[PDB]
Design a protein around this ligand. Structure first.
Ligand SMILES: [Ca+2]
Ligand SMILES: [Ca+2]
Ligand SMILES: [Ca+2]
Ligand SMILES: [Ca+2]
Ligand SMILES: [Ca+2]
Ligand SMILES: [Ca+2]
Ligand code: NA
Lengths: 168, 171
């Protein structure tokens, strides 16, 4: 039951930056590697694993996997895969910033906490084998309430002059 | 060293920063760069702060040369503000072109295989280093649409934007 139907294709050409021919072509590749048409979290991990002889990339992959799976049913189906591919590879600046925020905000309450931050940073190095993170966070955090909204994260990422401190 | 109106006028044309934003970044840049010039040695030490356990001197030097557009061995404010504008606010094509210029070490408008290895190597050094090369080779070959063994900006952008010929590179 892994085939691609026209109505799904047509939904996807509307919602993504891919043409029909392109979605079908990415579908072929996806199926080959994922014959059940579902890609598991460990499956995802194996993928990053190719990249880092160093480290355990597993934490980072889990976090990234968590944003990819829209319905949080433990799998990425093709629709979800192609949605995320389209954003991350062809999306505009603001879309990309939104998706980065969703990743940082693990618990989805619309705030990035110091710990929520520290975890992604921790994940990055772990994948690879601190006054600074605090420095960036604190400049972005314009009301100094230990909390980053989407607006603060967007403005700080787009080099609002508040961030000069954070550079050195 | 004061910021002239002509400089602000060209910078508001060339960048995404408003006049007001340009003057505040200029105050910030000056405080830590009293000379009005950023130096490669200076530029590397900054990188050393983020990467304690690596030697990021090679990566920083590559990045440095993209920033220093006139090639005179220093990053002035105009150079800094333009690279900051591109990397913080650029559309997808503009950021991918900045990426491409980083790879294209000799500035000849092409990325060779060697150029790509040099970049990958420098990241590894920075971070504490079958093979990476095999995996780089796959990406580069898929990117290389016409198989002439070099990459144009058009090939590199197409591949980065997930043209389906990049399937084999992920497989
Ligand atoms: Ca799912
Ligand atoms: Ca949260
Ligand atoms: Ca805040
Ligand atoms: Ca210069
Ligand atoms: Ca070149
Ligand atoms: Ca070529
Ligand atoms: Na402008």
């Amino acid at each position: 039951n892994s085939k691609l139907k026209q109505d799904t294709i047509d939904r996807l050409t509307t919602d993504t930056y891919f043409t029909e021919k392109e979605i079908r072509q990415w579908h072929k590749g996806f199926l080959k590697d994922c014959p059940n048409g579902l890609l598991t979290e460990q499956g995802f991990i194996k993928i990053y694993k190719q990249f880092f002889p160093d480290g355990d990339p597993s934490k980072f992959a889990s976090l990234v996997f968590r944003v990819f799976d829209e319905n949080n049913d433990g799998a990425i189906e093709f629709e979800e895969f192609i949605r995320a591919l389209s954003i991350t590879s062809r999306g505009n600046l603001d879309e990309k910033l939104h998706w980065a925020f969703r990743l940082y905000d693990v618990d989805n309450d619309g705030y990035i906490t110091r710990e929520e931050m520290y975890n992604i940073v921790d994940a990055i190095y772990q994948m690879v084998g601190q006054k600074r993170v605090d420095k960036i966070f604190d400049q972005m955090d314009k009301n100094h309430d230990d909390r980053l909204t989407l607006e603060e994260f967007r403005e700080g990422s787009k080099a609002d002059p508040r961030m000069v401190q954070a550079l050195s």
